[model samples]
Target chain A: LERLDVGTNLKKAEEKLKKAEELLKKSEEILKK
Target chain B: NSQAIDNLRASLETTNQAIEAIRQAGQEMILAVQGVQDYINN
Candidate 1:
């Protein structure tokens, strides 16, 4: 059960990191303007 | 656990680097615009 919980948390972290990457690209576009 | 912690740290650093890149671009752009403004005044 503990290992399962750790896996779940890591999955969420991975998703968040991916989202941050997308957002950063969007910020770059705005700065270009 | 150590592996997980390391991954998290790496991601955090990645995010910081992305932000720093944007900041560097923004600062350079600002200077360019300022130069244009000075040229207009001169």
Candidate 2:
């Protein structure tokens, strides 16, 4: 169903946002590392 | 946030105001001989 696709997209978007934040933290840690 | 000017201006304003309590501590440290100017500079 289209809702299933939307839900998957939303879930992936959340993952992408989390990954972006994690990458930001990783880069910050790299400066310290 | 623009309201805070990204913590930079506010931080500088606080520092300059604190320095204002001192005696001529703005030779080159504050970029200007005024508090508001320090607020704008740093």
Candidate 2 regions exceeding 4 Å error are A1-5, B1-42
Instruction: Provide the clashing-pair count of each candidate structure.
Output: 0, 0
Question: Model 1, A1-33: lDDT tens per residue?
Answer: 212123343444455556667756654554443
A24, model 2: CA deviation in Å?
A: 0.7
Best by lDDT: 1
Q: For residue B25, what is the lDDT in candidate 2? A: 28
Candidate 2: chain B TM-score against the reference chain B: 0.39
Scored against the true structure, residue B8 in model 1 reaches a CA lDDT of: 59
Q: lDDT tens string, model 1, B1-42? A: 776666556666656776665555555556656656665665
TM-score (C-alpha) between model 2 and the true structure: 0.35
In candidate 2, how many clashes are counted? 0
DockQ of each: 0.03, 0.01
Off by over 4 Å in 1: A1-33
Residue-by-residue lDDT tens digits, candidate 2, B1-42: 565454555455444444443323223233332544544555
Tens digits of per-residue lDDT for model 2, A1-33 = 211123343444455455555544544444443
